[PDB]
Ligand binder design. Structure first.
Ligand SMILES: *C(=O)[C@@H](NC(=O)/C(=N\OC(C)(C)C(=O)O)c1csc(N)n1)[C@@H]1N=C(C(=O)O)C(=C)CS1
Length: 509
């Protein structure tokens, strides 16, 4: 008797590690109890003890078997241990079977949840890297021939028709050591400032690798019960924000490349406002008259960068921001990753020219902002982004001339180190460079920004800190986000064994 059939052989999903082999997503065995209701219907006397062993009410269990009597497979319980999936088998109930199946476990939990994502109950990638690289990780199921009786019970294992092929190991660009550091410090900053959310991205300016990518709020992917959908957002890639003052270095790059501006050139920003018809550009610090181009960045003068933009024209500024990737497709293919928006016009009036120049009305992601600062730090050369470990670095694209990029770098080192600058971004033992931003959202709500890189002498790491809606008295990016940059950069440089470059001169010793 019986009918010849073919069942599948599940394939083992590939391991995801960090760049150094630390496990991030591992498919490990769990014991699962299943039943063939067609066989169970022949052993009704065994049902009550089976229900009791499974923690089910006898009536509800009997009803469930009756309501599935025409199926040949139902799950009884999933995710037990081999010891537990034997105490039920010890009842020797016909139609009850125990199997070992592989299910994802995430050893770092909430720390890398947004990057890694997760799989569904069938071990298929559903979010994050698990989805983006599902074909790589999934493998290919096998198949084997069986003989099944009239109730669907496998009577004979005949022969394997096709072997299963396991999925492939995938090493991410993430450095788990930096990820933990970034995760902890971003969390600390949210509580320090009573903020609603935040992101922090760390990039290797030489290889394009995303070394760390963390957000708050986050979630435990090992316990996705009653989860908030907002807690699962990889904000660094799928949320957009106005970068504000953090794009002024790119406006400055266009100014320097125009041949009309040098760093020691002077702009008059008195009295701290500039009327453009019915629109008024305003500075926070309004006790300045003449400022040089570095002072414009140190004071973060919207007036100053606006007058420069009028002189060189918006088109030159738009082109730099486009070339460094702001509002442009990263090409990475992360699920839900946003392109943002760099607004364009046929003709640029003064209002649109100024707002472009100081980052108002633009939409970027944290990844884009970090990649743009990586290109600035890398002497103007943009190495393509990667979420996976890069062994052979692809050729970069020269997006800012090396001379202009070097000059802007030095200016941003002064933003961090000069008198009146963003001193909380200073990294002990190293020269650091960057730019703060503070964006008013549409009571006033704010987004606090800092973007930078280090060491200034030979840049290695670019970093972006975004703090969404700090609720304490402090909200400027130089107060809220810069100290996070300092702590995380200091730890990252130490972990990567980068030599300290802030050493005394011969006369300052
Ligand atoms: C750069 O980001 C500048 N920011 C702004 O002009 C914006 N808002 O300014 C404040 C004072 C927060 C306002 O309430 O108007 C802005 C840009 S895009 C958007 N939606 N709002 C200057 N940046 C800093 C800094 O962090 O370095 C300052 C100290 C002065 S404002």
């Amino acid at each position: 008797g019986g009918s010849v059939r073919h069942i599948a052989i599940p394939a083992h999903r590939g391991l995801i590690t960090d760049r150094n082999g630390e496990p991030l997503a591992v498919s490990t065995p769990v014991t699962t109890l299943w039943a063939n209701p067609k066989e169970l219907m022949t052993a009704k006397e065994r049902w009550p003890q089976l229900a009791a062993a499974l923690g089910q009410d006898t009536k509800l269990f009997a009803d469930r078997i009756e309501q599935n009597a025409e199926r040949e497979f139902i799950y009884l319980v999933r995710g037990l241990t081999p010891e537990q999936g034997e105490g039920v088998i010890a009842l020797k109930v016909p139609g009850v079977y125990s199997i070992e199946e592989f299910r994802r476990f995430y050893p770092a939990g909430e720390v890398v949840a947004h990057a890694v994502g997760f799989t569904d109950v069938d071990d298929r990638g559903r979010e994050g890297i698990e989805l983006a690289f599902d074909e790589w990780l999934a493998g290919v199921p096998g198949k084997r021939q069986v003989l099944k009786d009239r109730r669907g019970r496998v009577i004979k294992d005949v022969q394997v028709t096709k072997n299963a092929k396991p999925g492939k190991t995938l090493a991410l660009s993430i450095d788990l050591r930096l990820q933990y550091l970034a995760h902890r410090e971003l969390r600390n900053a949210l509580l320090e400032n009573g903020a609603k959310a935040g992101s922090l991205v760390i990039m290797d300016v030489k290889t394009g690798e995303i070394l760390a990518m963390t957000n708050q709020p986050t979630y435990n992917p090992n316990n996705r019960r009653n989860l908030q959908p907002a807690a699962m957002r990889n904000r660094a890639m799928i949320d957009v924000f106005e970068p504000g003052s953090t794009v002024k270095p790119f406006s400055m790059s266009a100014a320097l490349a125009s041949g009309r501006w040098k760093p020691s050139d002077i702009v008059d920003v008195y009295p701290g406002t500039l009327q453009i018809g019915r629109y008024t550009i305003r500075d926070v610090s309004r006790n300045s008259r003449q400022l040089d181009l570095t002072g414009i960045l140190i004071k973060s003068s919207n007036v100053g960068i606006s007058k420069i933009a009028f002189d060189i024209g918006a088109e030159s500024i738009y082109s730099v921001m486009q070339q460094v990737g702001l509002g442009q497709d990263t090409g990475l293919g992360f699920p839900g990753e946003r392109v943002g928006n760099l607004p364009n016009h046929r003709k640029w009036p003064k209002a649109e020219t100024a707002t472009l120049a100081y980052g108002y009305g633009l939409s970027v992601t944290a990844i884009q902002l970090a990649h743009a600062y990586a290109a600035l730090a890398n002497d103007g050369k943009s190495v393509p982004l990667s979420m996976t470990r890069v062994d052979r670095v692809p050729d970069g694209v020269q997006v800012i001339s090396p001379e202009v990029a070097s000059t802007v770098q030095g200016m941003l080192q002064q933003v961090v180190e000069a008198q009146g600058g963003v001193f909380r971004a200073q990294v002990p033992g190293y020269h650091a460079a960057g730019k703060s931003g503070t964006a008013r959202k549409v009571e006033n709500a704010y987004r606090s920004l800092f973007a930078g890189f280090a060491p200034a002498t030979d840049p290695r790491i670019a970093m972006v800190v975004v703090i969404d809606e700090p609720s304490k008295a402090g909200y400027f990016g130089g107060l809220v986000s810069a100290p996070v940059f300092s702590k995380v950069m200091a730890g990252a440089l130490r972990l990567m064994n980068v030599p300290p470059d802030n050493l005394p001169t011969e006369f300052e010793a």
